[PDB]
Write a protein that binds this ligand. Structure first.
Ligand SMILES: N[C@@H](CCC(=O)N[C@@H](CS)C(=O)NCC(=O)O)C(=O)O
Ligand SMILES: N[C@@H](CCC(=O)N[C@@H](CS)C(=O)NCC(=O)O)C(=O)O
Lengths: 219, 221
């Protein structure tokens, strides 16, 4: 059985939460980068893409598409999805809030220039008034090092990845949230995450204008 | 002890897939309809909405927000989430396709009249050229009555809900997809689903301009 092989553009977009989770889990993977519309159309025409889209991951005999299908499978396989049905409800609730905020961040570079200020201001408002208070409250309420079950789960990994993007956006947004600051440091120091955070890993950068244009070209 | 209680507007939107799944699982539930901004504020103020949003379901002593958290819990509890990690992977892939389509459909009534025509045209095109082909191909690959593991799962339920909606929208779209038609018929005839499909059940109508205006009136009174 192979290393999982990740099909996506050479950028963050919709594959980056899978790169984080696999790296957090200590799992070696390979990437086949889509550089053109022709690369994508060949995957489609070869029947690799159930819904004609990427992300797609080749893992344990499957060609899985859909971010959540990929991540649930990885989380479940590497015991990062809790130990029972009630922990999974907490985990799902948390990571779905993270996905919603995440989505706004992923979509942001693609919005018309005249809308950016308004959209960014709204993401900053939701971070401050909605999402950071929600997660700080979880940490504050049980006083434990991990969001759920007193042990590392995907929710920790997904949230910390998000705290890194929020820092790139505005380093002060986290300032009033000391338990989130502390979660970020703790998880960043786990050997697997520490290595993924270091130069030269598969961690992808923020999108620049050449990438924004390229992603269009790939559609 | 208590029935699940579903906190939403009195219409489909983001709660309908849950009404379908619970009914398919044989679970009677209650609904508490949010009618005003006051009602929404009370749920928030009581601290029952983790991200200040609905849907919310009170089930088994918990208050579950996020549509997918709600559905995953229900599907796991009532054995509609396949039998192993690999079946769940197939289930999740299939149903996330449905969710992408669903998300366009649910937002359609709150589009400006100017974007509506094109949005609808796009929806139909994706049904016909992307999603119905994908699901037909899966049913054809194995010739079995159910999408995954040759037994009823949440994927069948969520697909068939989608097929009922697509029928309302344009009843010709399914015409080229004989295996989807057959699945729709089989699943519709299962005791629990048949009961949910009957007149007078909790199944909700398609949204009308009053539902739309109630939703706006709640978020922007
Ligand atoms: N719900 C899907 C969304 C995938 C998606 O939007 N994919 C884009 C690339 S980021 C794509 O393949 N676009 C081509 C298309 O939709 O026609 C997932 O989470 O994987
Ligand atoms: N990802 C969430 C989205 C929920 C959502 O957007 N709910 C809307 C109403 S249908 C809401 O409460 N909006 C008010 C707000 O976001 O302030 C889910 O699937 O439950």
């Amino acid at each position: 059985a192979e290393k999982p092989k990740l099909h996506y553009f050479n950028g963050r977009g919709r594959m980056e939460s899978t790169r984080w989770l696999l790296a957090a889990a200590g799992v070696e993977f390979e990437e086949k980068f889509i550089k053109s519309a022709e690369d994508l159309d060949k995957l489609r025409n070869d029947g690799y893409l159930m819904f004609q889209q990427v992300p797609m991951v080749e893992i344990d005999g499957m060609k899985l598409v859909q971010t959540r299908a990929i991540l649930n499978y990885i989380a479940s396989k590497y015991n990062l999805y809790g130990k029972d049905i009630k922990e999974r409800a907490l985990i799902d609730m948390y990571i779905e809030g993270i996905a919603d905020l995440g989505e706004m961040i992923i979509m942001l570079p693609f919005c018309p220039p005249e809308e950016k200020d308004a959209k960014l201001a709204l993401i900053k408002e939701k971070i401050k008034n909605r999402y950071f208070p929600a997660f700080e409250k979880v940490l504050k309420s049980h006083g434990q090092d991990y969001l759920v079950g007193n042990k590392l789960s995907r929710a920790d990994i997904h949230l910390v990845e998000l705290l890194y993007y929020v820092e790139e956006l505005d380093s002060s947004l986290i300032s009033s949230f000391p338990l989130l600051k502390a979660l970020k440091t703790r998880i960043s120091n786990l050997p697997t995450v520490k290595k993924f955070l270091q130069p030269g890993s598969p961690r992808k950068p923020p999108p620049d204008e050449i990438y924004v244009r390229t992603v269009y070209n790939i559609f």
